[PDB]
Amino acid sequence: MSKEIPTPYMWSYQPQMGLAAGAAQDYSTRINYMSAGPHMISRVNGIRAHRNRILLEQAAITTLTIRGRGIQLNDESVSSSLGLRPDGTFQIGGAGRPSFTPRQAILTLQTSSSEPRSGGIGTLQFIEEFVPSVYFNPFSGPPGHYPDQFIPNFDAVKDSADGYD
Amino acid sequence: INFASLAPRHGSRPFMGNWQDIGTSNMSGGAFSWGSLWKAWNSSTGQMLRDKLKEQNFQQKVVDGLASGISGVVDLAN
Amino acid sequence: FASLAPRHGSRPFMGNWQDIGTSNMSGGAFSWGSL
Amino acid sequence: PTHDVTTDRSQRLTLRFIPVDREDTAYSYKARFTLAVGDNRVLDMASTYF
Amino acid sequence: PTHDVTTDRSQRLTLRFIPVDREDTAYSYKARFTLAVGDNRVLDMASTYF
């Protein structure tokens, strides 16, 4: 309500694309003090101010035996045991000792993707980045100066995405 | 870490296939080549047998495995 | 270069260098597409 | 190519797995196999067929 | 000899292994076993017998 101690706005996540959907004022955690006197009402307003101070600030400032993949594996290069190879004479029966070659096997097992991505955001980074945002003087500018990110039906490039096509 | 030695050699040069070939297909928008191109009440005998022969064999254009045939022109049925 | 080529544009119409060819019945073929 | 493409050691091509356990009913029956793929091998499931 | 010959820990003398796979064909019979030799043991296959 008050343009100085405003109820905060809480973002909504779209898991599927990784972008952040529209947000809204928090409407599930409001305190109903409509049956209180000036004392508790001032106390509650001070509490909400403290909460807003916590939010603003937070947001602004805070932004051998390799483990393999959780089960370590040993590593040997000269562990070659069966030195024979079947020439015209020999006939090698069942064999095989699985050993990770130091350079070939391990590096080929831990290479990253060929080219890094460029798109949406995962859940953890969304939680760390999109804290609830406190909007102080709501919509106080001329048309076009409003925060359009809040409306979920608004597309950044093509403005005001017409629902239903 | 080079796997060229595994490939067939087309003569001093590995036969490395195009990297742009990894499968993707769904219900609509995905189309693949090699389409379904194709007591006689009637005794003609002739064209009949011939037609049966035709029915069991094939022809198209991207069938370019190996060679198209001598002098040329580029054509359709892509 | 060559001026002896059909020109479909100012640029000439020339095929791939690698065009010379072989097949033995063998199955020494059974090989893939032009693509 | 010559090397690093085919295993010289004795190895099968068409493995045959037998049903470890089988259940029956008046309308349907169940068959359970213990598919094994030893090391230095790769199995393409497309070839598998009951 | 007194020591370093026979274990004092509870260890079996004879082990029998139940088949894991079976097949009764019209002209054969295939049986499969999971021969398990635990540590601190050595098995002389001459002892084994179907």
Coordinates of all heavy atoms in Angstrom, one line a residue, chain E residues 3-4 11-12 15 17-19 22-23 26 28-29 33 35 37-38 42 44 46-47 49:
Chain E
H3 N 50.1 -74.5 13.8 CA 49.4 -73.3 13.4 C 49.8 -73.0 11.9 O 50.6 -73.6 11.3 CB 49.8 -72.1 14.3 CG 51.3 -72.0 14.5 ND1 52.2 -72.5 13.6 CD2 52.0 -71.4 15.5 CE1 53.4 -72.2 14.1 NE2 53.3 -71.6 15.3
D4 N 49.0 -72.0 11.4 CA 49.2 -71.5 10.0 C 48.9 -72.7 9.0 O 49.5 -72.8 7.9 CB 50.6 -71.0 9.7 CG 50.9 -69.8 10.6 OD1 50.0 -69.0 10.8 OD2 52.1 -69.6 11.0
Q11 N 34.2 -71.9 8.5 CA 34.3 -72.0 7.1 C 33.8 -73.4 6.7 O 34.1 -74.4 7.3 CB 35.7 -71.8 6.6 CG 36.0 -72.2 5.2 CD 37.3 -71.6 4.7 OE1 38.0 -71.0 5.4 NE2 37.6 -71.9 3.4
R12 N 33.0 -73.4 5.6 CA 32.5 -74.6 5.1 C 33.6 -75.5 4.4 O 34.6 -75.0 3.9 CB 31.4 -74.4 4.0 CG 30.0 -74.3 4.6 CD 29.5 -75.6 5.0 NE 28.1 -75.6 5.3 CZ 27.1 -75.7 4.4 NH1 27.4 -75.8 3.1 NH2 25.8 -75.7 4.8
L15 N 30.7 -77.0 -0.5 CA 29.7 -76.0 -1.0 C 29.0 -76.6 -2.2 O 29.6 -77.1 -3.1 CB 30.4 -74.7 -1.3 CG 30.6 -73.8 -0.1 CD1 31.1 -72.4 -0.5 CD2 29.3 -73.7 0.7
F17 N 26.2 -75.5 -5.2 CA 25.8 -74.3 -5.9 C 24.5 -74.7 -6.7 O 24.6 -75.6 -7.6 CB 26.8 -73.8 -6.9 CG 28.1 -73.4 -6.1 CD1 29.1 -74.3 -5.9 CD2 28.2 -72.1 -5.7 CE1 30.2 -73.9 -5.3 CE2 29.4 -71.7 -5.0 CZ 30.4 -72.6 -4.8
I18 N 23.4 -74.0 -6.5 CA 22.2 -74.2 -7.2 C 22.3 -73.6 -8.6 O 22.9 -72.5 -8.7 CB 21.0 -73.6 -6.4 CG1 20.5 -74.6 -5.3 CG2 19.9 -73.2 -7.3 CD1 20.1 -75.9 -5.9
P19 N 21.7 -74.3 -9.6 CA 21.8 -73.7 -10.9 C 21.0 -72.4 -10.9 O 20.0 -72.2 -10.3 CB 21.1 -74.7 -11.8 CG 21.0 -75.9 -11.0 CD 21.0 -75.5 -9.6
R22 N 18.4 -72.8 -16.5 CA 18.1 -74.2 -16.9 C 17.5 -74.1 -18.3 O 16.8 -73.2 -18.6 CB 17.2 -74.9 -15.9 CG 17.9 -75.2 -14.6 CD 16.9 -75.7 -13.6 NE 17.5 -76.0 -12.3 CZ 16.8 -76.2 -11.2 NH1 15.5 -76.3 -11.2 NH2 17.5 -76.4 -10.0
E23 N 17.7 -75.2 -19.0 CA 17.0 -75.4 -20.3 C 16.9 -76.9 -20.6 O 18.0 -77.5 -20.7 CB 17.7 -74.6 -21.4 CG 17.3 -75.2 -22.8 CD 17.9 -74.4 -23.9 OE1 17.7 -73.2 -24.0 OE2 18.5 -75.1 -24.8
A26 N 14.9 -80.7 -26.4 CA 14.6 -82.1 -26.8 C 15.8 -83.0 -27.0 O 15.7 -84.2 -27.0 CB 13.8 -82.1 -28.1
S28 N 19.2 -81.8 -25.4 CA 20.3 -81.3 -24.6 C 19.7 -80.9 -23.3 O 18.6 -81.1 -22.9 CB 20.9 -80.1 -25.3 OG 21.5 -80.5 -26.5
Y29 N 20.6 -80.4 -22.4 CA 20.2 -79.9 -21.1 C 21.4 -78.9 -20.7 O 22.5 -79.4 -20.4 CB 20.0 -81.0 -20.1 CG 19.3 -80.5 -18.9 CD1 17.9 -80.4 -18.8 CD2 20.0 -80.1 -17.8 CE1 17.3 -80.0 -17.7 CE2 19.4 -79.6 -16.6 CZ 18.0 -79.6 -16.6 OH 17.4 -79.1 -15.4
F33 N 26.0 -72.1 -13.5 CA 26.3 -71.9 -12.1 C 27.1 -70.7 -11.9 O 27.8 -70.3 -12.8 CB 27.0 -73.2 -11.5 CG 26.3 -74.4 -11.7 CD1 26.6 -75.3 -12.8 CD2 25.3 -74.8 -10.8 CE1 25.9 -76.4 -13.0 CE2 24.6 -76.0 -11.0 CZ 24.9 -76.8 -12.1
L35 N 29.9 -69.9 -9.8 CA 31.0 -70.4 -8.9 C 31.6 -69.2 -8.2 O 32.1 -68.3 -8.8 CB 32.0 -71.2 -9.8 CG 33.0 -72.0 -8.9 CD1 32.2 -73.0 -8.2 CD2 34.0 -72.6 -9.8
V37 N 34.2 -68.2 -5.3 CA 35.3 -68.6 -4.4 C 35.7 -67.4 -3.5 O 36.2 -66.4 -4.0 CB 36.5 -69.0 -5.2 CG1 37.6 -69.6 -4.3 CG2 36.1 -70.1 -6.2
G38 N 35.3 -67.4 -2.3 CA 35.6 -66.3 -1.4 C 37.1 -66.2 -1.1 O 37.9 -67.0 -1.3
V42 N 41.3 -71.3 -1.7 CA 41.7 -71.7 -3.0 C 40.9 -73.0 -3.3 O 40.8 -73.9 -2.5 CB 43.2 -72.0 -3.1 CG1 43.9 -70.7 -3.1 CG2 43.6 -72.8 -1.9
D44 N 40.5 -76.3 -5.8 CA 41.1 -77.2 -6.7 C 40.0 -77.8 -7.6 O 39.2 -78.6 -7.1 CB 41.9 -78.3 -6.0 CG 42.7 -79.1 -7.0 OD1 42.2 -79.4 -8.1 OD2 43.8 -79.6 -6.6
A46 N 39.7 -80.0 -9.6 CA 39.5 -81.5 -9.6 C 38.5 -82.0 -8.6 O 37.9 -83.0 -8.9 CB 40.9 -82.1 -9.4
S47 N 38.4 -81.3 -7.5 CA 37.3 -81.6 -6.5 C 35.9 -81.5 -7.1 O 35.1 -82.3 -6.8 CB 37.5 -80.8 -5.3 OG 36.3 -80.9 -4.5
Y49 N 32.6 -81.3 -9.3 CA 31.9 -82.4 -10.1 C 30.4 -82.1 -10.1 O 29.8 -81.8 -9.1 CB 32.2 -83.8 -9.5 CG 31.6 -84.0 -8.1 CD1 30.4 -84.7 -8.0 CD2 32.2 -83.5 -7.0 CE1 29.9 -84.9 -6.8 CE2 31.6 -83.7 -5.8 CZ 30.5 -84.4 -5.7 OH 29.9 -84.6 -4.4

